[PDB]
Amino acid sequence: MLSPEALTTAVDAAQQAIALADTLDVLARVKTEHLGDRSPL
RNA sequence: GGCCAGGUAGCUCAGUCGGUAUGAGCGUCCGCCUGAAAAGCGGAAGGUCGGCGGUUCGAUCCCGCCCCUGG
């Protein structure tokens, strides 16, 4: 699960959803899913 | 003077001498529910753990000065 290849796939969907965040409210949700305490990272 | 105890979520406070503060109660949001609510049940959001530095792959947790609280 640690695999740096699978690790890179996590930062991919993060920055992708971050770049696809159009509003500040969507970002706060995106930050929760990709940077919060329950995020895969 | 030099040593102590404290600073932690919106409020009142626990807790940790390195990888989750599974933080609590209340406060906020969603669902079931109701004409609409609340409780109840179920699901979530939110803290840069007092500031600035030092070490470490990584410090609320280990080192130094200071901000301010009763000692």
Q: What are phi and psi of A22, to 5 degrees?
A: -85, -35
Taking the CA atoms of A24, A29, A35 and A37 in sequence, report the sign of the dihedral they define.
positive
**Whole-number Å distance, CA A7 to C1' B40?**
43
The experimental resolution of this structure, in angstroms, equals 2.5
Which nucleotides of strand B come closer than 7 angstroms to any CB of the protein? 20-21, 23, 44-46
What is the Cα A25 distance to its own chain's centre? Answer: 15
Q: How far apart are CA A29 and CA A5, in angstroms?
A: 26
Provide, for chain A, the percentages of residues in helix, strand and coil under a 3-state DSSP scheme, each rounded to the nearest 5. 70, 0, 30
